Design a protein around this ligand. Structure first.
Ligand SMILES: [Cl-]
Ligand SMILES: [Cl-]
Ligand SMILES: [Cl-]
Ligand SMILES: [Cl-]
Ligand SMILES: [Cl-]
Ligand SMILES: [Cl-]
Ligand SMILES: [Cl-]
Ligand SMILES: [Cl-]
Ligand SMILES: [Cl-]
Ligand SMILES: [Cl-]
Ligand SMILES: [Cl-]
Lengths: 133, 133, 134, 134
């Protein structure tokens, strides 16, 4: 078994948040694995851009969710740190690793989320979004 | 005899104290192993910096706590020296190591702390803190 | 609960195995925490080098062991992956963290090992090294 | 409570060993405290040079001596690692920390050393010295 380190973001663009659809047909947030020597904030920005083609700015740390899963017979413990981001540039274009990447009005996003983990993160994110905007 | 000597910091910013959330979900103070050739004070400043992204200045030496634990059938002796710090700059951001990093009002901090050692150290820190202001 | 992931190495040179003498006087294998963004193989080669001054080359994955312990009343899970290595260069020189670093004939090393995990891993290592004629 | 790390050497020149005289008037081996980032072998070379003005080359690790003592109202667990060294450059001169620095024939050195640890380290060093043209 091994541990996996990932970081991603809840990026907002004028009342809308960036979401992606996983191979399992679940809408969640853009995230990705750490690169050698990166701090989580660095990983978060890079992976969001690579997965959605959208470049964002980190405003604050929201939280972390974790879970076990298997890949090729080995148990993997994954931890994902999430950061509140604000739109910079680019357009949503899902990489081959996600079924889709699209902006959704906050109202629309709330319902799409499945995993209680993502919903908790989004909730926290919205609250933090206030103090900043 | 295995001996693990660490150093940590109890940093304050306008009536608030800096705490980190450990993998056990318990809120505590940033601390880490004192590397060979490193003064405990340097270890404390570095660990606070690395785990929270907050830079602090040491005001005084609070105290030290001792405890043992068993690993692979062997007794290990551990001690942690704590230093009182005052905020200098930086914004609370957790490392891949911790779940969170946040400032808490003293009243609330006393509530979050769990380890008897953290409580004893915090109480000593509050008294030593008056010396300054 | 907190989970710790480490990696270590079982390195052979001219038919002998490299062991380190821990603070408790127990001879064991070098190992260390797998840093974020680090492959377990990188961790093993690095730890062997830092603890013994010996540079090794990964031959293959041996296996992993795990165990639990309590710290400050909290349960902690720890697992360690081990890799088979062949000597590349360097002389045994212990780090500040260990008492000694030395090569031992397999027969002697088997008697020196104490930790259950080390014994299990060494057994697997001995069966695996046959392929590389070490 | 704190840990202290030092390293030094049993350095030979033309069959003689380099000794220093401590403030307590005892002949012993040159050694000193680790600096930030140093491996023990690095500390040993630098400290022997600073303490005696003699540059030595490390040939092997001898062993270590450890003990608890009190410094400025605090218990310190000190570990001193020793290395067999070959003379390379310099003339012995005591630093401000020692009373003298001088080379002595092995037979005389054996008689001069007083601390049990020093005697044991010297015994080990002489055995290791046999493997080199030192
Ligand atoms: Cl597995
Ligand atoms: Cl990873
Ligand atoms: Cl990911
Ligand atoms: Cl620690
Ligand atoms: Cl362990
Ligand atoms: Cl380890
Ligand atoms: Cl601890
Ligand atoms: Cl003490
Ligand atoms: Cl020291
Ligand atoms: Cl010294
Ligand atoms: Cl040299």
């Amino acid at each position: 078994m091994k541990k996996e380190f990932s970081a991603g973001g809840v990026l907002f663009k004028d009342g809308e948040v960036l979401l992606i659809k996983t191979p399992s047909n679940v809408w969640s947030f853009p995230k990705g694995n750490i690169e050698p020597g990166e701090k989580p904030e660095e990983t978060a920005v890079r992976e969001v851009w690579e997965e959605t083609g959208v470049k964002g700015e980190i405003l604050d740390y929201i939280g972390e969710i974790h879970y076990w899963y298997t890949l090729k017979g080995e148990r993997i413990f994954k931890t994902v740190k999430y950061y509140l981001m604000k739109y910079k540039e680019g357009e949503p274009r899902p990489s081959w690793e996600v079924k889709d990447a699209k902006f959704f009005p906050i109202k629309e996003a709330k319902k799409l989320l499945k995993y209680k983990g993502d919903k908790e993160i989004f909730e926290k994110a919205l609250k933090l979004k206030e103090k900043f905007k």
